[PDB]
Amino acid sequence: MITDENKKLAQWAMDYALKNGCQAAKVLLYSSSNTSFELRDMDRLQQASEGGLSLSLYVDGRYGSISTNRLNRKELETFIKNGIDSTRYLAKDEARVLADPSRYYKGGKPDLKLYDAKFASLNPDDKIEMAKAVAEEALGKDERIISVGSSYGDGEDFAYRLISNGFEGETKSTWYSLSADITIRGEGEARPSAYWYESSLYMNDLIKKGIGQKALERVLRKLGQKKVQSGKYTMVVDPMNSSRLLSPMISALNGSALQQKNSFLLNKLNEKIASDRLTLTDEPHLVKASGARYFDNEGIATERRSIFDKGVLNTYFIDTYNAKKMGVDPTISGSSILVMETGDKNLDGLIAGVEKGILVTGFNGGNNNSSTGDFSYGIEGFLIENGKLTQPVSEMNVTGNLITLWNSLVATGNDPRLNSSWRIPSLVFEGVDFSGL
Amino acid sequence: MITDENKKLAQWAMDYALKNGCQAAKVLLYSSSNTSFELRDMDRLQQASEGGLSLSLYVDGRYGSISTNRLNRKELETFIKNGIDSTRYLAKDEARVLADPSRYYKGGKPDLKLYDAKFASLNPDDKIEMAKAVAEEALGKDERIISVGSSYGDGEDFAYRLISNGFEGETKSTWYSLSADITIRGEGEARPSAYWYESSLYMNDLIKKGIGQKALERVLRKLGQKKVQSGKYTMVVDPMNSSRLLSPMISALNGSALQQKNSFLLNKLNEKIASDRLTLTDEPHLVKASGARYFDNEGIATERRSIFDKGVLNTYFIDTYNAKKMGVDPTISGSSILVMETGDKNLDGLIAGVEKGILVTGFNGGNNNSSTGDFSYGIEGFLIENGKLTQPVSEMNVTGNLITLWNSLVATGNDPRLNSSWRIPSLVFEGVDFSGL
C-alpha cells in the first residue's frame, strides 16, 4: 500500500514547495513493482521495485516539472528549492493554472476493484510455469518452426496525488500478462513471425491456455502471402487490429492537437462526420476494467461521455491548459475506456457475409497526416471471396482519408477485447482502396 | 559524490545477497541528476534526481537481475531475498559465471577527468540563456521559417560497482548539450526540417555559438531536393553521418551476434576484408573524452585494441558469457571510443576531388541484414559534379553489401567529431550504387 508515512512525505513536499516560492503545486508520490520472466526455446528473470515523487511547480507565473526518487528530506529540500528557483527563470505562461476545484473528483464512488489482493502472495514458480506451458503448446508441433518465445509479466502500481487548491486522491492497480512469439521457416529466406497475448487485472482471471497454440496458428497463416489486384474491396478488421484505425481519430480529439491547429477533426464538433454505425463512448467507471479511473492527472472527475453518437462527434478531450488557450470549456485530458457499440456477429460471421473483401490481420508501417486525415498503411491478411478466406495477402497498402473511412463503416462485431482499455470489436468498411507495394 | 554511507549500503547489499543464497553477485549503486530546458519560438523545464541499486544474482547455477530505488534496509532485505528465491526457479545456465579476477581493472591509472567540478555551482539562468541565444541566431532570419526549437540539456552520473570475487570500482562524469531544430516552408505542403547540436563533458568547453545558424543553413539546403539518375557514384559522407555506415559493422563484432550465428563478420577474424584505408582502434583511455573508461560492467579492464588495421579485422567484442558459450577467449563486452585513422583533407577538400558523386548529409530509413551485411538506406544530400555540389538530392536509396562497401573506402577526412565516442571523420567510397525511390 501507500502508507501513512508515504502520505505524510507527500504532504510535507507540498507544504515545502508552497512555503518556498510556489503560489501553487501538484505532488505525485508513486510506486510500483514488477516481475518479468522470458523464455526462448535462455531463461531470463527481471524484477523491479520503484518509488518516487514528482512535482509540478507554479512559480511566479512560470511552470516547471521535477521528479526524484531520492527522498531524504534534506536532499528533497535542496532539490525542490532548486526546482522552484530554476522554474522562475522561464518565461511566464499565464495559461498554466490549476483547475477549478468544483471539477475535482469528490470521492465516494464505488470501489473500481482494479487491484488483485492476491498479488503479494503469488508464488514466482507458478508464474514461470505458466510461461513454460505457453511455449509447450507450440514446441515441436511443426517442422517449419525456428523459435518459440514466451513471456510472463506482472506489476502493481500505486499513486497518491495532491493539488494545492484542495485535491487529494489515490489509486492502486495490478496487471498480469502472458505471451507467445513464434518464428518459422518461410519461402527462400523469409522468416515470418506472429504472436498472441492475454492480460488481466486478476491472476485468477488471466487466460493461461491457448496462447502458444494461437501464435502458431497465426504464423502458419502467413505462409504463401502475395499481393492481390489493386482496387476497391470491403475491408474486414479483427479485434486484435480494429483499434489501430480508430487511434488517429482519437489523437485528433486531443486539446493540444486542436490548439496547435494540427487536427483533421478541428471544427467538426457536433457534426455528422461518420457512419450511423459508429457509436463510441468513454466509460471511465467500469468495475474491474483496464483503464477505469475516477480522475485524471489534473484531479478532474471523469464522466461518461458520448464521443460519437451514430456518427456525430460529441466530445473533444481538452485539459485545463488547452481550454484556457483556446478560450473554450475543458472536458477531461483524455479518454479512459473506449467502448464501441457492438453488432450481433463475430468475426467469422462478418467474413461470411462479404462477397469481395480483404481481412486485415495486421498492419505493417505507414502513417496518417494529423491535419488532413489522409492515410496509407501496410496490411496483411486474407482475400475474402464469397464469404470465405482464400489467398493469404501481404505487400499491399490501404489508403484513403480517415473521415470517409469511418463514414463507410457498415458493421461492428460482438467481439471486443475486454482486457484492453480499447473495447473495439471487429469492423467492416465498404469501398476501401488497396494498392500494391 | 557517492558517499561512504552509499558505499556501505552497496557493501551491505552484496553481503546480504551472499549470505542468503547467492554463490556470487554483482551490485551497482548508481545516481544521476539532470536539467532540461526546451524552447520553441512554450518554455519548458524538467529536472530529475535519481539513485538506485541493481544486482545480478548467481543462485544455484541460475542467473537473475533485480533493481530498486527503494533503499530502506528492511524493504531491501525482502526484495533481495525474493529475487534470489525467484531466480532459483529458472533453468540453470552454467555459462553465467564471473570473470577471472586476474582480468579486472586493478586501479591506479591516471584520472580520466570526465567530471566537470563546476557542475554543481552552475546557474540555471545561464543555461536557459544559452538555449535562448541558440534560437535567436535563426529567429526572424528567413521568411520561409515555420518554427525554431532549441534545447539545453545537462547531467551528472555516478556509479559504484562491486563483484563478489574481488572487484570494486567507481566512475563519475558530466555532460552538457545544446541543440537547435528548425522547420521551414518547402514546396507545396513540404515542411522540411534540420538540426544541429554541440556537446561536451565540460561547460567551459561546450560550443555555444553557431548552432542555430548551422541548423538554419542545413534546412535551407534541403530546398529543391530531387532524385538523380540511378547508377554508380562516388559516395562522400559527412562527419555528422559517417558513423552510421560503421555502426552495423561494429554490431557484427558483438559476441552475442557471433554466438547466435547472426553476424556477417563471423569467421572473418584476422582476414583482409576491407580497405587499406580502414584503420580503426578502440581507445578507452583518452582523457577528458566521451566514452572513456577503465572497465566495463563486468569489471574487465579496458585495453587499447586494433579493430581494423589497414582492412584486416583484428577484434571481436566478446564478454565472459559469450566467450564461455563459444569456447573462445573473452575480450571486452564492447568498444569505448572508436577512432578512425584520419587523412589530410576536410570535407570540403574531399568534395573538391570528386568528379561524379553524391554527398550524403542524412539517412532516411532502411536497414542491413545482420547475417549477410546487405544494406539499403535512404539518403539525401547533394550531387557532386567536377568537385562542386550541385543538385540537392533526396528520394534515393544507397544499396550494396557492407563488406564490399568498406572495401571501397578510398579516403578519410581530418574532421572527426571529437565530442562523440565515435571519432569518425568524413569518408569517401568509390563505386557505390544509388537507385530511385
Tab-separated table of N, CA and C in Angstrom, chain A residues 1 6 30-32 34 37 39 42-52 63-70 79 82-87 89-93 123-125 128-129 132 321, chain B residues 1 6 30-32 34 37 39 42-52 63-70 79 82-87 89-93 123-125 128-129 132 321:
chain	number	residue	atom	x	y	z
A	1	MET	N	0.822	-1.237	0.000
A	1	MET	CA	0.000	0.000	0.000
A	1	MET	C	0.851	1.281	0.000
A	6	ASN	N	4.277	7.474	3.889
A	6	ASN	CA	4.383	7.925	2.479
A	6	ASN	C	3.522	9.181	2.265
A	30	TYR	N	4.494	7.989	-6.234
A	30	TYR	CA	4.140	6.798	-6.977
A	30	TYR	C	5.009	5.667	-6.507
A	31	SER	N	4.495	4.453	-6.675
A	31	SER	CA	5.358	3.310	-6.514
A	31	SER	C	4.856	2.175	-7.360
A	32	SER	N	5.750	1.266	-7.612
A	32	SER	CA	5.357	0.125	-8.441
A	32	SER	C	6.309	-1.021	-8.125
A	34	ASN	N	7.362	-5.026	-10.211
A	34	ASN	CA	7.110	-5.862	-11.366
A	34	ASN	C	7.984	-7.088	-11.410
A	37	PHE	N	9.369	-12.782	-16.557
A	37	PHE	CA	10.079	-13.979	-16.972
A	37	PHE	C	10.001	-14.066	-18.499
A	39	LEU	N	11.280	-16.603	-21.800
A	39	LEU	CA	11.763	-17.888	-22.203
A	39	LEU	C	11.944	-17.894	-23.717
A	42	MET	N	17.177	-20.013	-22.592
A	42	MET	CA	17.822	-18.802	-22.103
A	42	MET	C	16.848	-18.113	-21.150
A	43	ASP	N	16.439	-18.818	-20.089
A	43	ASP	CA	15.513	-18.270	-19.084
A	43	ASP	C	16.026	-16.952	-18.594
A	44	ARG	N	15.147	-15.983	-18.531
A	44	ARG	CA	15.517	-14.691	-18.027
A	44	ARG	C	14.498	-14.230	-16.961
A	45	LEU	N	14.992	-13.620	-15.890
A	45	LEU	CA	14.178	-13.002	-14.865
A	45	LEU	C	14.648	-11.569	-14.648
A	46	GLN	N	13.714	-10.677	-14.681
A	46	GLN	CA	13.890	-9.292	-14.158
A	46	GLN	C	12.839	-8.925	-13.178
A	47	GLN	N	13.276	-8.361	-12.063
A	47	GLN	CA	12.327	-7.828	-11.088
A	47	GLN	C	12.725	-6.394	-10.734
A	48	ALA	N	11.738	-5.576	-10.455
A	48	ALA	CA	11.971	-4.162	-10.137
A	48	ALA	C	11.020	-3.679	-9.095
A	49	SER	N	11.467	-2.734	-8.265
A	49	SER	CA	10.643	-2.098	-7.266
A	49	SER	C	11.006	-0.620	-7.257
A	50	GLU	N	10.046	0.246	-7.483
A	50	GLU	CA	10.424	1.665	-7.706
A	50	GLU	C	9.456	2.530	-6.933
A	51	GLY	N	9.903	3.722	-6.517
A	51	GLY	CA	9.030	4.672	-5.868
A	51	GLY	C	9.615	6.039	-6.032
A	52	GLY	N	8.780	7.025	-6.289
A	52	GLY	CA	9.308	8.381	-6.412
A	52	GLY	C	8.296	9.484	-6.164
A	63	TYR	N	5.955	27.693	-14.970
A	63	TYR	CA	5.526	26.305	-14.702
A	63	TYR	C	6.672	25.353	-15.032
A	64	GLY	N	7.043	24.542	-14.044
A	64	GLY	CA	8.205	23.642	-14.095
A	64	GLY	C	7.846	22.278	-13.563
A	65	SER	N	8.576	21.270	-14.041
A	65	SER	CA	8.395	19.892	-13.603
A	65	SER	C	9.662	19.262	-13.084
A	66	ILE	N	9.604	18.682	-11.888
A	66	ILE	CA	10.732	17.994	-11.337
A	66	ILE	C	10.323	16.598	-10.819
A	67	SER	N	11.282	15.697	-10.739
A	67	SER	CA	10.960	14.359	-10.256
A	67	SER	C	12.198	13.719	-9.676
A	68	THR	N	12.022	12.998	-8.559
A	68	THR	CA	13.111	12.383	-7.868
A	68	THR	C	12.701	11.115	-7.158
A	69	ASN	N	13.682	10.235	-6.999
A	69	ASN	CA	13.444	9.084	-6.160
A	69	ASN	C	14.358	9.082	-4.985
A	70	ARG	N	14.998	10.224	-4.718
A	70	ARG	CA	15.922	10.379	-3.634
A	70	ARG	C	15.216	11.180	-2.564
A	79	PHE	N	16.524	19.874	-3.628
A	79	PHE	CA	16.017	19.565	-4.938
A	79	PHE	C	14.798	20.426	-5.275
A	82	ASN	N	15.736	24.214	-5.578
A	82	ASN	CA	16.422	24.424	-6.843
A	82	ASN	C	15.454	24.374	-8.004
A	83	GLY	N	14.463	23.470	-7.966
A	83	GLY	CA	13.439	23.407	-8.978
A	83	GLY	C	12.592	24.677	-9.075
A	84	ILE	N	12.245	25.212	-7.908
A	84	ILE	CA	11.452	26.441	-7.835
A	84	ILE	C	12.230	27.609	-8.453
A	85	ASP	N	13.484	27.741	-8.034
A	85	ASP	CA	14.301	28.860	-8.466
A	85	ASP	C	14.638	28.762	-9.959
A	86	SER	N	14.819	27.534	-10.449
A	86	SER	CA	15.051	27.294	-11.858
A	86	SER	C	13.807	27.599	-12.709
A	87	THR	N	12.668	27.222	-12.206
A	87	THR	CA	11.383	27.428	-12.891
A	87	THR	C	11.146	28.905	-13.083
A	89	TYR	N	13.110	31.210	-13.778
A	89	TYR	CA	13.841	31.750	-14.905
A	89	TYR	C	13.178	31.576	-16.279
A	90	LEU	N	12.190	30.715	-16.331
A	90	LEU	CA	11.396	30.516	-17.559
A	90	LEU	C	10.607	31.787	-17.892
A	91	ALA	N	10.117	31.880	-19.112
A	91	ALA	CA	9.087	32.872	-19.416
A	91	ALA	C	7.819	32.461	-18.804
A	92	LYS	N	7.071	33.420	-18.272
A	92	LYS	CA	5.811	33.051	-17.680
A	92	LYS	C	4.811	32.530	-18.722
A	93	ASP	N	3.978	31.625	-18.238
A	93	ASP	CA	2.864	31.099	-19.036
A	93	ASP	C	1.571	31.201	-18.266
A	123	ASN	N	3.202	-17.104	-6.051
A	123	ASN	CA	4.459	-17.844	-5.991
A	123	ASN	C	5.145	-17.702	-7.363
A	124	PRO	N	6.366	-17.176	-7.389
A	124	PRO	CA	7.049	-16.943	-8.660
A	124	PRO	C	7.173	-18.206	-9.448
A	125	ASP	N	7.265	-19.331	-8.786
A	125	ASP	CA	7.347	-20.566	-9.527
A	125	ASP	C	6.121	-20.915	-10.384
A	128	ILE	N	6.474	-18.593	-13.634
A	128	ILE	CA	7.333	-19.109	-14.684
A	128	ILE	C	6.789	-20.409	-15.303
A	129	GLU	N	6.111	-21.245	-14.519
A	129	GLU	CA	5.434	-22.412	-15.093
A	129	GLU	C	4.391	-22.065	-16.164
A	132	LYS	N	6.250	-21.396	-19.288
A	132	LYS	CA	6.642	-22.668	-19.847
A	132	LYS	C	5.499	-23.387	-20.547
A	321	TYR	N	-5.224	23.594	-19.353
A	321	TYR	CA	-4.299	24.463	-20.097
A	321	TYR	C	-4.758	24.772	-21.512
B	1	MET	N	28.839	13.483	-4.924
B	1	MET	CA	29.661	12.246	-4.924
B	1	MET	C	28.867	11.002	-4.491
B	6	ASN	N	26.679	5.632	1.130
B	6	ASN	CA	26.228	4.952	-0.110
B	6	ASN	C	27.034	3.659	-0.321
B	30	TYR	N	23.906	3.419	-8.368
B	30	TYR	CA	24.034	4.460	-9.366
B	30	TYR	C	23.288	5.672	-8.889
B	31	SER	N	23.715	6.829	-9.385
B	31	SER	CA	22.896	8.001	-9.205
B	31	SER	C	23.141	8.966	-10.330
B	32	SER	N	22.193	9.839	-10.496
B	32	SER	CA	22.337	10.814	-11.578
B	32	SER	C	21.471	12.018	-11.229
B	34	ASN	N	19.835	15.636	-13.624
B	34	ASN	CA	19.767	16.258	-14.929
B	34	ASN	C	18.883	17.478	-14.956
B	37	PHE	N	16.110	22.249	-20.467
B	37	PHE	CA	15.292	23.375	-20.884
B	37	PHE	C	14.976	23.201	-22.372
B	39	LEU	N	12.845	25.171	-25.619
B	39	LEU	CA	12.246	26.380	-26.096
B	39	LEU	C	11.686	26.134	-27.494
B	42	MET	N	6.866	28.527	-25.450
B	42	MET	CA	6.394	27.431	-24.615
B	42	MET	C	7.593	26.892	-23.839
B	43	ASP	N	8.243	27.756	-23.052
B	43	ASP	CA	9.406	27.366	-22.238
B	43	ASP	C	9.063	26.161	-21.418
B	44	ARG	N	9.951	25.197	-21.417
B	44	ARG	CA	9.750	24.017	-20.625
B	44	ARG	C	11.016	23.721	-19.792
B	45	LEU	N	10.825	23.312	-18.543
B	45	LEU	CA	11.885	22.858	-17.669
B	45	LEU	C	11.518	21.493	-17.102
B	46	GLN	N	12.432	20.588	-17.219
B	46	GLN	CA	12.426	19.315	-16.442
B	46	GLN	C	13.699	19.096	-15.715
B	47	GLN	N	13.573	18.739	-14.447
B	47	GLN	CA	14.750	18.357	-13.669
B	47	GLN	C	14.486	17.013	-12.989
B	48	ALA	N	15.530	16.232	-12.836
B	48	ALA	CA	15.417	14.898	-12.235
B	48	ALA	C	16.611	14.577	-11.404
B	49	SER	N	16.411	13.795	-10.339
B	49	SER	CA	17.477	13.319	-9.490
B	49	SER	C	17.160	11.873	-9.140
B	50	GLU	N	18.050	10.960	-9.453
B	50	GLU	CA	17.659	9.533	-9.329
B	50	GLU	C	18.811	8.789	-8.693
B	51	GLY	N	18.510	7.695	-7.982
B	51	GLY	CA	19.541	6.849	-7.426
B	51	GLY	C	18.963	5.488	-7.203
B	52	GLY	N	19.727	4.454	-7.493
B	52	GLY	CA	19.215	3.109	-7.246
B	52	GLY	C	20.281	2.041	-7.081
B	63	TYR	N	20.706	-17.440	-12.986
B	63	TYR	CA	21.158	-16.037	-13.074
B	63	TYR	C	19.944	-15.129	-13.258
B	64	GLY	N	19.819	-14.155	-12.359
B	64	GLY	CA	18.663	-13.251	-12.265
B	64	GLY	C	19.116	-11.826	-12.080
B	65	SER	N	18.266	-10.897	-12.520
B	65	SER	CA	18.522	-9.469	-12.381
B	65	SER	C	17.415	-8.733	-11.671
B	66	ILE	N	17.762	-7.961	-10.646
B	66	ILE	CA	16.797	-7.165	-9.950
B	66	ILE	C	17.294	-5.710	-9.797
B	67	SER	N	16.367	-4.788	-9.629
B	67	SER	CA	16.771	-3.395	-9.476
B	67	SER	C	15.708	-2.639	-8.718
B	68	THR	N	16.146	-1.744	-7.820
B	68	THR	CA	15.256	-0.997	-6.989
B	68	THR	C	15.805	0.363	-6.632
B	69	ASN	N	14.877	1.279	-6.380
B	69	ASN	CA	15.295	2.549	-5.836
B	69	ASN	C	14.710	2.770	-4.484
B	70	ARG	N	14.185	1.703	-3.875
B	70	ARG	CA	13.570	1.755	-2.581
B	70	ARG	C	14.543	1.131	-1.607
B	79	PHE	N	13.199	-7.587	-0.818
B	79	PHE	CA	13.349	-7.515	-2.247
B	79	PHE	C	14.461	-8.448	-2.732
B	82	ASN	N	13.561	-12.210	-2.142
B	82	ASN	CA	12.580	-12.616	-3.137
B	82	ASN	C	13.219	-12.785	-4.498
B	83	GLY	N	14.167	-11.908	-4.866
B	83	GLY	CA	14.899	-12.041	-6.101
B	83	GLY	C	15.721	-13.327	-6.194
B	84	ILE	N	16.365	-13.664	-5.080
B	84	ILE	CA	17.177	-14.880	-5.005
B	84	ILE	C	16.294	-16.118	-5.199
B	85	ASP	N	15.191	-16.150	-4.458
B	85	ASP	CA	14.316	-17.308	-4.473
B	85	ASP	C	13.608	-17.456	-5.825
B	86	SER	N	13.282	-16.325	-6.453
B	86	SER	CA	12.694	-16.322	-7.777
B	86	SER	C	13.686	-16.793	-8.851
B	87	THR	N	14.907	-16.362	-8.726
B	87	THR	CA	15.980	-16.709	-9.671
B	87	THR	C	16.193	-18.202	-9.664
B	89	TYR	N	14.168	-20.547	-9.437
B	89	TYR	CA	13.186	-21.254	-10.233
B	89	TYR	C	13.474	-21.329	-11.739
B	90	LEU	N	14.397	-20.512	-12.186
B	90	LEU	CA	14.848	-20.540	-13.590
B	90	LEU	C	15.555	-21.866	-13.894
B	91	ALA	N	15.720	-22.175	-15.164
B	91	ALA	CA	16.660	-23.227	-15.548
B	91	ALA	C	18.033	-22.746	-15.357
B	92	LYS	N	18.912	-23.617	-14.879
B	92	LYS	CA	20.273	-23.181	-14.698
B	92	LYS	C	20.963	-22.866	-16.032
B	93	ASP	N	21.872	-21.910	-15.937
B	93	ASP	CA	22.735	-21.552	-17.069
B	93	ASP	C	24.182	-21.550	-16.647
B	123	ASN	N	24.649	28.148	-12.761
B	123	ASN	CA	23.433	28.915	-12.510
B	123	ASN	C	22.424	28.558	-13.618
B	124	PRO	N	21.248	28.062	-13.243
B	124	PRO	CA	20.270	27.632	-14.240
B	124	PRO	C	19.921	28.747	-15.172
B	125	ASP	N	19.976	29.970	-14.708
B	125	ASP	CA	19.682	31.063	-15.602
B	125	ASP	C	20.641	31.235	-16.789
B	128	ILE	N	19.524	28.406	-19.402
B	128	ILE	CA	18.416	28.756	-20.270
B	128	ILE	C	18.756	29.920	-21.217
B	129	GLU	N	19.592	30.861	-20.784
B	129	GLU	CA	20.075	31.899	-21.700
B	129	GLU	C	20.819	31.354	-22.927
B	132	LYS	N	18.242	30.207	-25.316
B	132	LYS	CA	17.692	31.376	-25.964
B	132	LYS	C	18.603	31.941	-27.042
B	321	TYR	N	30.308	-14.388	-20.696
B	321	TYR	CA	29.244	-15.350	-21.021
B	321	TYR	C	29.335	-15.904	-22.434
